[PDB]
């Protein structure tokens, strides 16, 4: 289940 939404994940960190 690899995380593909890098843009959103970066903003959530």
């Amino acid at each position: 289940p690899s995380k593909r939404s890098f843009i959103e994940d970066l903003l959530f960190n």
Partner: antibody
Amino acid sequence: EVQLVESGGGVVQPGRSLRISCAVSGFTFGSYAMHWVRQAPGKGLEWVGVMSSDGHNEYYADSVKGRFTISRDNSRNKLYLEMNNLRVDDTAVFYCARGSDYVDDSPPLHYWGQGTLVTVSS
Amino acid sequence: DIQLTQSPSSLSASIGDRVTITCRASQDIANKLAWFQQAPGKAPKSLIYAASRLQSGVPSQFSGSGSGTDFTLTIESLQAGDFATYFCQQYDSFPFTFGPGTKVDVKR
């Protein structure tokens, strides 16, 4: 082919809550952040919010103020939007849209569903 | 949040015209700027992302430029399907936000 399909819209009385849903095909749902967008009749596109691919994180438009909640089920691969305390001007088409993909250089909101219409009326 | 302003709010044009629509952000959004097209009763279509990258399946008379706060959508040679409403949208930071839309109709 990427496909997103919203369901659950219809006529609902003000003050009630309504849960709409989005089902997907053509990609691994659990890999993606997922977004909702709304469009009131004759008005512009308005972002509602997003939930992270694992469900741990969410973010909403400034105007939501806790009144709408996004959820997801990475076993049935469904996205939900629960809209509470509905008022007449909540009437709008609601679109689900996929989050970004860094591997394919796909931006957030590349792929959209066809929308589902929520009509708030007494 | 970040406000996106578009100019003009509406314009009329003819087949074969060069049309330019601008989007201005209230904060620097680097290149994290997209353009959408919407026809009546249809979901919007992603045209442009990363300010200047044309999306797959989109005809290349569309092009985007700009970085930071000022962005332009150029339609180099307007065609029949391009009479539509255009929205810019930023994904530099949460909450994501859209501009108000610019409608392009047929000149007569």
